[PDB]
Amino acid sequence: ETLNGGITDMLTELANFEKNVSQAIHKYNAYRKAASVIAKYPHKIKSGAEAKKLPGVGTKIAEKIDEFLATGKLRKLEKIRQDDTSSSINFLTRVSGIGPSAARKFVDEGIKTLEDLRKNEDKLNHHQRIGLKYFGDFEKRIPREEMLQMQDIVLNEVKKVDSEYIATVCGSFRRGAESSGDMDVLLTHPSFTSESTKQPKLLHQVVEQLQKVHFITDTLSKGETKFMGVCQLPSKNDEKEYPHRRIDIRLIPKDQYYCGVLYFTGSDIFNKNMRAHALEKGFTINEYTIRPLGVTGVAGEPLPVDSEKDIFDYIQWKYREPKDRSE
DNA sequence: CATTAGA
DNA sequence: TCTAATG
Ligand code: NA
Ligand code: NA
């Protein structure tokens, strides 16, 4: 967690550089584990060989290690830090719809600046275009203050169309969190579950609604289960407009909300940690279900949930507020 | 890791 | 189809 700081840190640098700049999945994959072992490692690593002794830690890494152990730097790390070509990529990627593969190509054609992108708005697809459009706005964090207005508004339509709907903004916003990235409203409806072969309009109905009232302004992808778009709080009585937000809404089988619901509300840990709990409490939890564990190794038979409650009740926990889903 | 664009 | 990007 700290003793191994600089090592682990450089390692991930390196690592990331591989994947991104180069199409070096192996190396890339290499550093990570390397980076991973030593993290877990209990002592203050002192040198190449010292590391060396570990699974994953080979010669290559080791070497770089010492030099780092020697100079508070590393070369390759430095060069890459320098190289526009590589820095160029790390930049492009910031655009929704822009990835490494694109970032690289985009570069070879020479696009390297956000401005470059404008100039070749055509060379980009509706995603990235939208990605590019609201570029500034996407980087900004979401105020909880805002978070609720929005929240309010969304629920406002959901119910409006049909009362039978149930939608939930999951995440951090949900964990009391001061700010969010993008909001996630986990959708579902009674008439829809594990079997009742869809009702696509189920989604479509909503999306439409929000578009109607002007909350969603753009679509990034509408599927018949997941939608990804961009929204905005009606910019009040002139003088101050809202930034453009990323939103995501998804349909769910009322027979898996809570589950899927427990899950997204995390935290990323509370989950592993809650997930870690059900294993010993004779269960299994994953994004949609709770399965009673059978001694053969595995088992099946997904247990019937009506609130975030049952799950705790099942594996037998203390119901914990979203507030307290901290770790 | 599953869902949507694309091409 | 496959592959990329998002989550
Ligand atoms: Na070793
Ligand atoms: Na991106």
Please report, for the domain that includes residue A217, its CATH number.
Answer: 3.30.460.10
A220 alpha carbon to ligand 2 midpoint, in Å? 13
Same domain, A258 and A147: yes
Strands A226-231 and A285-286, sheet pairing: unpaired
- Ion ligand 1: protein residues whose beta carbon lies under 5 Å: A 54
Nearest ligand, measured from the Cα of A139: 2
The 3 state secondary structure assigned to chain A is: CCCCHHHHHHHHHHHHHHHHHCCCHHHHHHHHHHHHHHHHCCCCCCCHHHHHCCCCCCHHHHHHHHHHHHCCCCHHHHHHHHCHHHHHHHHHCCCCCCCHHHHHHHHHCCCCCHHHHHHCHHHCCHHHHHHHHCHHHHHCCEEHHHHHHHHHHHHHHHHHHCCCCEEEECCCCCCCCCEECCEEEEEEECCCCCCCCCCCHHHHHHHHHHHHCCCEEEEEEECCCEEEEEECCCCCCCCCCCCCEEEEEECCECCCHHHHHHHHCCCHHHHHHHHHHHCCCCCCEECCEECCCCCCCCCCCCCCCCCHHHHHHHCCCCCCCCCCCCC
User: What does the block give as tokens for A240?
Assistant: 């101050």
For residues A181 and A147, give the distance between their C-alpha atoms in angstroms, rounded to a whole number.
Answer: 10
Our measurement of CA A250 to C1' B2, in angstroms, reads: 12
- Structural domain count, chain A: 4
Our measurement of CA A172 to C1' C4, in angstroms, reads: 28
Our measurement of CA A180 to C1' C7, in angstroms, reads: 14
A127 alpha carbon to ligand 2 midpoint, in Å? 10
Residue A112 backbone dihedrals phi, psi, to 5 degrees: -145, -20
Of A242, A263, A284, which residue is a domain's last?
A: A263
Residue A151 belongs to domain spanning: 141-263
For residues A53 and A225, give the distance between their C-alpha atoms in angstroms, rounded to a whole number.
Answer: 49
Our measurement of CA A323 to C1' B3, in angstroms, reads: 29
Same domain, A230 and A281: no
Greatest extent of chain A over all pairs of C-alpha atoms, in Å? 67
Same domain, A133 and A236: no
- The answer to whether A283 touches A313, Cβ cutoff 8 Å, is no
Task: Name the nucleotide with the smallest C1'–CA separation from A97.
Answer: C5
**Residue A52 C-beta-side C-alpha neighbours within 13 Å:** 9
User: Is A64 in the active site?
Assistant: yes
Q: Is A5 annotated as a binding residue?
A: no
Our measurement of CA A51 to C1' C3, in angstroms, reads: 38
**Residue A156 C-beta-side C-alpha neighbours within 13 Å:** 13
In 3D, which of A185, A210, A186, A161 has the Cα closest to residue A288?
A186
- The answer to whether A311 touches A256, Cβ cutoff 8 Å, is no
For residues A206 and A220, give the distance between their C-alpha atoms in angstroms, rounded to a whole number.
Answer: 15
Q: Which residue is nearest to nucleotide B3 (CA to C1')?
A: A226
Q: Is A291 annotated as a binding residue?
A: no
Of A40, A63, A83, which residue is a domain's last?
A: A83
Same domain, A127 and A184: no
Same domain, A60 and A127: no
Burial (CB count <10 Å: 0-12, 13-18, 19+), residue A183: buried
Residue with tokens 């191994």: A4
Same domain, A235 and A146: yes
Task: Name the nucleotide with the smallest C1'–CA separation from A106.
Answer: C4
For residues A311 and A303, give the distance between their C-alpha atoms in angstroms, rounded to a whole number.
Answer: 9
- The answer to whether A317 touches A285, Cβ cutoff 8 Å, is no
Cis, peptide link before residue A267, omega less than 30° from 0: yes
In angstroms, how far is the first alpha carbon of chain A from the final one?
16
For residues A130 and A123, give the distance between their C-alpha atoms in angstroms, rounded to a whole number.
Answer: 13
CATH code of the domain covering residue A123: 1.10.150.20
Same domain, A3 and A23: yes
Q: Is A85 annotated as a binding residue?
A: no
Q: Is A184 annotated as a binding residue?
A: yes
For residues A12 and A33, give the distance between their C-alpha atoms in angstroms, rounded to a whole number.
Answer: 10
In 3D, which of A99, A101, A105, A96 has the Cα closest to residue A123?
A105
Residue with tokens 């009606």: A234
Residues 6+ apart with CB under 8 A from A75: A67
Q: Which residues touch strand B (CB under 7 A)?
A: A 125-127, 221-226
Task: Name the nucleotide with the smallest C1'–CA separation from A221.
Answer: B4
Conformational region of residue A97, where left means phi above 0, alpha means psi within -120 to 50, and beta covers everything else: left
A322 CB neighbour count, 10 Å cutoff: 20
Same domain, A149 and A234: yes
For residues A215 and A249, give the distance between their C-alpha atoms in angstroms, rounded to a whole number.
Answer: 13
Same domain, A231 and A273: no
A50 alpha carbon to ligand 1 midpoint, in Å? 9
A90 alpha carbon to ligand 2 midpoint, in Å? 10
For residues A283 and A274, give the distance between their C-alpha atoms in angstroms, rounded to a whole number.
Answer: 11
Indicate the residue type of A217: T
Of A140, A159, A178, which residue is a domain's last?
A: A140
**Residue A168 C-beta-side C-alpha neighbours within 13 Å:** 24
Rounded to 5 degrees, what angle do the CA atoms A137, A230, A96 make? 65
The resolution, in Å, is 3.3
Active-site residue (options: A64, A254, A272, A318): A64
CATH code of the domain covering residue A312: 3.30.210.10
CATH code of the domain covering residue A21: 1.10.150.110
Q: Which residue is nearest to nucleotide B1 (CA to C1')?
A: A287
Q: Which nucleotides of B are covered by protein (CB under 7 A)?
A: 3-7
- The answer to whether A227 touches A203, Cβ cutoff 8 Å, is yes
Same domain, A173 and A161: yes
Q: What is the CA radius of gyration of chain A?
A: 24
User: What does the block give as tokens for A204?
Assistant: 């479509």
Same domain, A131 and A159: no
For residues A186 and A260, give the distance between their C-alpha atoms in angstroms, rounded to a whole number.
Answer: 8
